[PDB]
Amino acid sequence: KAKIGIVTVSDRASAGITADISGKAIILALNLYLTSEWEPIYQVIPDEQKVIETTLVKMADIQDCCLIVTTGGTGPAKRDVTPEATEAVCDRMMPGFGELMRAESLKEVPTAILSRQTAGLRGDSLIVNLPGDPASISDCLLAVFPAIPYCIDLMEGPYLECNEAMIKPFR
Amino acid sequence: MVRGIRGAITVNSDTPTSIIIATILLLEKMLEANGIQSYEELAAVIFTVTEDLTSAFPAEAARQIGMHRVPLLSAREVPVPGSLPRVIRVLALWNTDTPQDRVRHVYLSEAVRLRPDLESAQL
Secondary structure: OEEEEEEEEOHHHHOOOOOOOHHHHHHHHHHOOEOOOEEEEEEEEOOOHHHHHHHHHHHHHHOOOOEEEEEOOOOOOOOOOHHHHHHHHOOEEOHHHHHHHHHHOOOOOHHHOOOOOOEEEEOOEEEEEEOOOOHHHHHHHHHHHHHHHHHHHHOOOOOOOEOOOOOOOOO | OEEEEEEEEEOOOOOHHHHHHHHHHHHHHHHHHHOOOOHHHEEEEEEEEOOOOOOOOHHHHHHOOOOOOOOEEEEEOOOOOOOOOOEEEEEEEEEOOOOHHHOOOEEOHHHHHHOOOOOOOOO
């Protein structure tokens, strides 16, 4: 039974004012893609840097889910601290995730260079950032997910089985 | 006694996933905004993609949320030059006595530009 963490970062959704929506899209894309048994671990937290550090650490080590996904807090507003919380909790940085997603939301929206997304590894767990817009969540998830099952396999994580119709993994 | 519910949403690429996710997101938001408890209240639901969205059906997404009960139908909204591209639009027909000014319309993503202005021209 593989496990995946989905984390929504927004004071609006954490206080219950608005529906998360952005995280719902991540779960929907993951109900696609994946043909294998998988369980989602999912919390909605505010733009508190230490609170983000905890939910990531708790999911990466105690829950031990192989892949963690964040959404929001990646822009240039002083509120946004989602990337900074990822750099503290990870031993190593995967710079190719942010560079690719920044260019593949860019040929559609030019105000995507204003992103601070990044990704890293907490030992055996892979954490990746996504923005708040769901329409660019599918565009960003689609762009990096082919390498993720191979990456999780490289860290001896659970084998991710992919759907040939919805996505295309490389190994 | 029926009311219409307009919906709209955009995608950032023409892939089967992005079409299905955007469709379900818009569909489930349209029902939640109006308090739709069950699909039995809907008479039928209708979708419009543009000319540039083709890789998948809005029905295939609607069937993965249990709307086999619901009659579905889709086509291509007019390919107008300079119009908002890659937009999926929804007209769900709702057996209800709700007043017309009460029905929540749901324009999401970059498709909020299509949100009807309350005072636009009005010749």
